[PDB]
């Protein structure tokens, strides 16, 4: 019984991750913020 519950839970984990697209936002936001900072720095070259 414990073996079947464990295997079923792992399979539900992988296809739930495969379905929901907004799962990894904790990582993604980090990347976004860094890129966004660099972006503003570049356009500060175009100010008088």
């Amino acid at each position: 019984l414990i073996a079947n519950q464990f295997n079923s839970a792992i399979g539900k984990i992988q296809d739930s991750l495969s379905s929901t697209p907004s799962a990894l936002g904790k990582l993604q936001d980090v990347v976004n913020q860094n890129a966004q900072a660099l972006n503003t720095l570049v356009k500060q070259l175009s100010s008088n």
Binding site: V42, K43, L45, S46
Partner: protein
């Protein structure tokens, strides 16, 4: 002179870099091309268009 680091002076626009045959298709009323950081990255040769 192309594919060499040269000092270019195109109609008073001054700079340093490598001139390369491009793939950008200018419209006939345009004579420059700028970057996000306001640096020219495409230019039209005033003698041979």
């Amino acid at each position: 002179v192309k594919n060499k680091c040269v000092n270019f002076n195109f109609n008073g626009l001054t700079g340093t870099g490598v001139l390369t045959e491009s793939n950008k298709k200018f419209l006939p009323f345009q004579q420059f091309g700028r970057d996000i950081a306001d640096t020219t990255d495409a230019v039209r040769d005033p003698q041979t268009l």
